[PDB]
Design a protein around this nucleic acid. Structure first.
Lengths: 455, 450, 456, 450
RNA sequence: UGAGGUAGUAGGUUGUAUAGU
DNA sequence: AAACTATACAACCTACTACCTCAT
RNA sequence: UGAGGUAGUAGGUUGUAUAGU
DNA sequence: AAACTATACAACCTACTACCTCAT
């Protein structure tokens, strides 16, 4: 008779060598590892956007409560949590009038409006970065809702064309942080945050500190010389332009640092054959990028390299992978998917499965219940009934419990959101964003490898 | 010798701020006495409070909140603090903390007016900074900072009802295994006895055209009633392959590979289920990739079966429940079942726009949880089972397939505790945060709902 | 028997709306206007570079004193003068191995050797700024004595020029600067006698670091509205046998201590035979149009009167090309600043030379001005032997000679690479040489940054 | 023992002004009591305010602002200050401070009217020194018992000078104007009497070949010694121009323009000098564009001309002063003179290398200073002359040019004070400072100098 | 930081190799 | 188709704008 | 963030247009 | 120069790999 094995909740390190489980409570208790002295925030938008940013940046100075701290922990304050400085003064500001917007809105091509508005914001940001002397570490962009309701993605090509100058920025909607007076015709806020102000403050603060340059939290258990290569398989889709395979890759080596290199556009196997079997040259180029960057950042050769993807791996690609890697090291490829259905229902009570349960069907294939009820939060992250992920290793000698606990540890390193956990591992989560940003503009040849310029 | 820091406040009001201050103070080396981490239940509180106040307390910290100036207990604590600070003849004992910006300075009690309250209104970090430098100016003996003790205390007190336990808990899945499979396949080499324009889906029983052969699960005498020319067929030309060899992975011939043997098997399983439950007379829905089904209201008695709730109406809309089945034999010979709910207007016809159906499914999703889902799933499978233990299929006039109506159940080694019903409302609030973190082109279909 | 009419020393604004003539004493007394929260420093060099840099920053953390504060006032420690923190921790270190440098050294070509070191340094800090997480604001590159002597077209100009596109601020510090204790020749005396001016070293380094941080140390006293000062560079580009001509540029100071500085044209016109350094009507129109549009950007109004500073005479066709783009309400003034004219006023009796601010007026369109000499505040002379004046001319236009004298005497007090009381030339021409040398060292620059933190 | 300084200002306003004055006073060596620093939140105010007002304070300061004009604590502290001022019989106990200029002198309360106000309005440094100049709060810091006085004296007494002063002083320049300009500038149209291969450098009088004319300063009948072709040339062919019209710019003819007239005149005055100066048997050192001239050993006696030394000796090289003159015309008819200084190794021949000359010149720069420069230059000018008020120029055999040997003198309305000679050592220190700051490829010439 | 160093051109001289009427 | 004597640029004769060097 | 909605093909079935000796 | 007939990929028969949006 078959049972389900359990994987313990992994720990995340904090300040002074301390470990917790929930990053929100640990942030309220200990604080970040490496400290930054402060950040000067810049805003581009109308005067309404400036006053709304000032009223929030203020509001977030004061402590904000939720209904309870069991699921939605309180916000002690920016300086109390992170130990940095944030104010309403020394804020640079670039304004936009409504004459040009009204005059150009009456055109026939929506894409022309997207182009010229994004270039308006881009050249204002670039000119401020190249003529003004006050240092700006983060640029916060406020968008009016008229262009959202009357006029492919904005921030996608915004970050893509800002990527050649290496400037971090974040996009803030007008209804996000001014929801008090943004209601529909009926009379209720459709973006209602009447209880959720703590989550909004937590997410904004964590994103701002990540774009600041500081490291909020990392993971502890790292054996000497192990690298996880989360291989992007997001498909570029730009019509008759030959998309083929624009695979990218992440790697996590010694901290939460994500050093993502540009995979080749890959003229092999135009999408009539999308089985994604990499030819030796491009495969060894990708592996050589990963290995050389590991050599640069750690000076020692990797003992074992893990590969995360979403499709199956065949023999010629693996033999191409193996020869460049030396005789000592070991390589393993892991496939993660969501489409496989297996839903487990609970006999008594009204609660879901717990996070940490694992189901093994063989040495190669297994399951893992990432989402569900969490004892610490005393709730579940998922909605309705959680859906697991199917994990199978193609070939390579490794322990199944090790890869299960490794993906479970990797699930908690989300930096854009201050949530307990997400379903997919954060390598595959940053996969979609890195692909969308990097294949929104072909015109870049040496993109940066950091993360603050993407999320 | 006195080295303890005393904090007084409203336990169920300033708990958060008091917990933050106590944990930070115990992490920065100052030993702190408070009613959160120490004063648990089951103890006599007042004698210990007085003894610690007037024996080993060197500084007193009263929270001046809106609820911190009318409760009786904080007033009594302040009275005994006034008595002990008059005994010590020291004016640096009562250190007020004011955390509510709504509280005016003229409403505060008389013993707190004379001393200037430490600010905790606009921010807390520099408030802790001035508390620390006032403490070190007042020359309180301190211990070297050791956040490890704070970690141990935080694990000890604040993680009591929020940690998993070791108990056995039983779960049942959506997987239904076949107990009985036909032993052989029947490959029919009809060749010229079939028209070229023959669509194989029109037969009463599963079949697949396969090169020069017609694979099926029934004999050659089955197709007589629809094909007059099949009466001249000889059964010796047909070939048979034992399904034990296929399912055990030991059959690999040049004719049909094992992969295609399993593919043909699962194809006949899938459309055998399709034709079987067409024979039940349960109405159909045009699903995008699979085939979806739903049961008409007015057939089941009381809209009930074994005291279970399956069909209903919420706002002038009768919603129905249904399942979709696809065979998968990769880990085990198991028939899958996936649940979908279907919305009708008058119980006969279907909504023209699929956006309305998607919106109704997502609107009615949150009102129940996996208890109701498990109940409805077992109800649908038990109804589909013309039998009591399994499902009598309809694949052959003779050979049949029997898949049990009970799903496979598994048990886990460790689980959690069962709280009250606040958690489900908080999961509804989780659905609210899922509204509040993502939205895309909702205006037109929301305007079209009325 | 004539007179030298005096011009009062203009003041520089400080924090809390305060003004004091000396920037060092004023900084020690009140402080800068905008307080930055701190800087993270990234260093490229050997282990000795880290040891020397850390020891020097620890030394400048504590207060230090000179022989006398007559010339260089007190240094109360970095926190007590600037208000922001800069300590030994959170310092980013990028490795430099001596094996590859020694292997590259042995080649016969010094040019390929300079090419490979500038490539190495650029590669190191580019992969620092393109994949690392920690924010690095100022990059402190340190070079030892062997590289500085055995590779002697300079390091600094081409380093900054190839760094110009990516918009990174960096500062180059010699090992001789901050290791004067053991920088010893064969005799025994230190080459860099910084022992009595450690306060001066700390003041200069700290002011440069704070300017490269992003905060303005000091502003100007009184600027009349609608008045901007343009200093016309004419740095002679010298790259071998190319069709050479000129590469004129400009510096703009309008309402702040920041100079929006733009790139002039490559100069395919007016060959050195007619090398009297003029502007074509098209190029002059482009130059003044850029000035007018920059004023409209940074002040949201049109300027009333526009100054032009230069080192050579102007003409009539350039001016009637200039005036067709200015609005009719505006007034144009050209100023020529010379240094080679000999006029030495000795003193009949006393213990000092002629003091700063005594100006000699010979006509309304041109006069002398003594921007260098004695000042009653500092109680010493910035010059040596006998100072030399500067000759100021208004080639075209109508204005008051006292006004241009006052404007130049105000403009000569904005040096940012050095914490000095005053300098000889106005800072609009002092910055001219380095901006021209940086822009004319690399051919790949098309639209460069206008902020000044990437040049000094 | 009363030694504290009391600062009373609006609680939330002037916090900067107060905290500044406050700190600066504690850094200068004064014990100062202020609300912001010493009365931190967490303490009692009014009892402590009374205690150090009636026991420990010695000087009372009020910050008079519009915000602090009607703030209750300010006039409460003022009332207790008036009471203690009547107690301890000190009419200068209250030292008011003024920051806000918008208020008049009667809007402040009547307690501040009686006493003088320290000017802190336009700037705070002069206000600080006026506060320091007050009696019972003098430059002597709190009657300092033991130490910590070097930093404060290094701040105050060694940084005294901040303003300027007015006095009349006389300066003499380096310019030497021409007294009696010659009447006629002579042009000799020799045409065919000037050989094509002849050279202007050779003749003993100034001349310029102007197209077909020879523009000289003297008559046409003085060149007989170098060509015998002159006597066939008649003087009426030669034209004459009065120098008044070309000096005033009035002479406008197609032959020579006015600025061309000035250029010709300055070229021949430059030539006329060299010639005469050369006729005075003084040696000659080559320069880049002009020529350098120095006195050899054996001519000047005692190394003293008008009680001024001109030649000298150090190390193993002898140094000789010199000049190089070049005239102009635009501000006045003035001939400039520039100061030069030329070395030698034994007083006969010069250095073979110019780099040694530049190195030794900058070595000798720091040894002397401005009065020595003026002395050497003026002694050189008087030695060049033969009369007492001009210099005889050998322009022709009949016409002499007289140039004012006395340098032009100017006077200045504003001046400075004359300090002692320590600042000369400071200036040589500054020369060493410029040695410490700028240096470029100095190793080779320093190694080769020995 | 300023005084001496070299290359060689601001603006009118007269020596080369053609052509205006 | 060719007489008289200037042109057509243009190298070069005493002088003014720059870049590089040395050293306190 | 998860479940419905949608274009398009694994990989070996059988119809287009030959050419092989 | 020509008998048989599969040829040499190729159009496509039911279901696997990723997208993408509708709202909680």
């Amino acid at each position: 008779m078959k049972e389900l094995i359990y994987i313990e909740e992994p720990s995340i390190l904090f300040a002074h060598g301390q470990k917790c489980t929930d990053p929100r409570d640990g942030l309220a208790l200990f604080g970040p590892l490496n400290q930054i002295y402060g950040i000067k925030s810049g805003v581009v938008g109308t005067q309404k956007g400036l006053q709304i940013f000032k009223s929030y940046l203020d509001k977030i100075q004061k402590p904000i409560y939720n209904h309870n701290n069991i699921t939605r922990p309180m916000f002690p304050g920016f300086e109390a949590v992170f130990g940095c400085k944030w104010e309403s003064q020394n804020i640079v500001f670039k304004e936009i009038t409504d004459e040009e917007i009204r005059r150009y809105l009456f055109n026939a091509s929506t894409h022309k409006r997207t182009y010229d508005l994004v270039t308006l914001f881009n050249d204002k940001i670039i000119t401020a970065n190249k003529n003004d002397e006050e240092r700006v570490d983060v640029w916060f962009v406020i968008v009016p809702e008229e262009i959202y309701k009357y006029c492919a993605q904005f921030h996608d090509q915004l970050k893509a064309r800002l990527l050649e100058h290496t400037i971090p920025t974040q996009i803030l909607r007008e209804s996000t942080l001014a929801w008090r007076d943004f209601k529909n015709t009926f009379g209720a806020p459709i973006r209602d945050f009447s209880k959720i102000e703590g989550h909004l403050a937590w997410t904004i603060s964590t994103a701002a500190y990540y774009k600041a340059g500081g490291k909020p939290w990392k993971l502890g258990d790292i054996r000497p010389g192990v690298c996880y290569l989360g291989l992007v398989y997001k498909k570029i889709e730009k019509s008759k332009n030959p998309q083929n395979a624009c695979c990218a890759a992440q790697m996590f080596l010694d901290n939460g640092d994500g050093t993502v290199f540009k995979g080749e556009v890959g003229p092999w196997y135009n999408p009539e054959k999308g089985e994604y079997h990499l030819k030796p040259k491009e495969a060894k180029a990708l592996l050589t990028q990963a290995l050389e960057s590991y050599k640069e950042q750690n000076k020692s050769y990797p003992k074992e390299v893990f590969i995360h993807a979403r499709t199956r791996f065949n023999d010629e690609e693996w033999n191409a992978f193996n020869e460049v890697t030396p005789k000592n090291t070991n390589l393993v490829g892991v496939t993660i998917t969501k489409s496989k259905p297996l839903k487990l229902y609970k006999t008594e009570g009204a609660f879901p499965i717990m996070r940490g349960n694992a189901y093994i069907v063989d040495e190669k294939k297994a399951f893992l219940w990432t989402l569900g009820f969490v004892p610490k939060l005393q709730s579940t992250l998922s909605m309705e009934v959680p859906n697991p992920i199917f994990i199978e290793i193609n070939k390579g000698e490794a322990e199944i419990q090790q890869v299960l606990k490794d993906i479970l540890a990797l699930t908690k390193l989300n930096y854009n959101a201050c949530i307990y956990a997400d379903g997919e591992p954060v390598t595959l989560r940053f996969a979609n964003k890195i692909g969308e940003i990097l294949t929104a503009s072909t015109e870049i040849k040496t993109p940066p490898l950091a993360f603050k310029y993407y999320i | 010798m006195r080295n303890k820091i005393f904090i007084s406040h409203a336990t169920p009001e300033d708990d958060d701020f008091t917990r933050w201050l106590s944990l930070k103070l115990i992490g920065l080396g100052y030993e702190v006495w408070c009613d959160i981490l120490f004063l648990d239940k089951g103890v006599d509180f007042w004698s210990t409070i007085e003894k610690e106040i007037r024996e080993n307390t060197c500084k007193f910290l009263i929270v001046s909140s809106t609820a911190g100036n009318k409760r009786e207990g904080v007033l009594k604590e302040l009275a005994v603090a006034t008595k002990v600070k008059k005994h010590l003849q020291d004016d640096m004992f009562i250190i007020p903390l004011a955390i509510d910006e709504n509280l005016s300075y003229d409403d505060i009690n008389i013993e707190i007016v004379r001393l200037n309250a430490i600010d905790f209104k606009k921010s807390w970090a520099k408030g802790l900074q001035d508390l620390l430098d006032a403490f070190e100016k007042q020359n309180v003996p301190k211990k070297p900072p050791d956040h490890s003790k704070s970690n141990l205390l935080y694990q000890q007190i604040f993680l009591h009802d929020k940690q998993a336990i070791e108990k056995e808990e039983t779960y049942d899945s959506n997987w239904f295994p076949i107990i009985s499979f036909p032993n052989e396949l029947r490959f029919h080499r009809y060749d010229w006895r079939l028209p070229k324009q023959f669509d194989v889906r029109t037969l009463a029983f599963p079949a697949i055209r396969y090169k020069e052969y017609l694979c099926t699960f029934a004999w050659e005498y089955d197709f007589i009633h629809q094909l007059p020319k099949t009466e001249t067929y000889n059964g010796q030309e047909s070939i048979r392959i034992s399904t034990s060899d296929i399912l055990s992975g030991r059959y690999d011939t040049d004719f049909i590979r094992n992969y295609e043997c399993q593919r043909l098997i699962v194809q006949l399983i899938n459309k055998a289920f399709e034709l079987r439950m067409k024979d039940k007379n349960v109405r159909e829905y045009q699903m995008s990739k699979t085939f979806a089904y739903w049961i008409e209201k007015g057939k089941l008695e009381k809209d009930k079966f074994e005291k279970i709730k399956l069909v209903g109406k919420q706002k002038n809309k009768y919603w129905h429940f249904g399942i979709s089945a696809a065979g998968k034999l990769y880990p085990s010979p198991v028939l899958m079942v996936s649940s979908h709910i279907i919305f009708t207007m008058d119980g006969i016809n279907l909504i023209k726009s699929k956006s309305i159906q998607h919106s109704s499914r997502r609107k009615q999703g949150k009102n129940w949880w996996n208890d109701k889902w498990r109940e409805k799933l077992l109800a649908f499978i038990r109804f589909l089972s013309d039998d009591q233990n399994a499902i009598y299929l309809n694949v052959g006039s003779e050979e049949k397939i029997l898949i049990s109506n009970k799903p496979l159940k598994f048990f886990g080694k460790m689980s959690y505790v069962t709280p009250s019903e606040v958690t489900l409302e908080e999961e509804s609030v989780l659905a609210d945060i899922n509204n509040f973190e993502e939205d895309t082109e909702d205006l037109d279909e929301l305007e079209d709902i009325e």
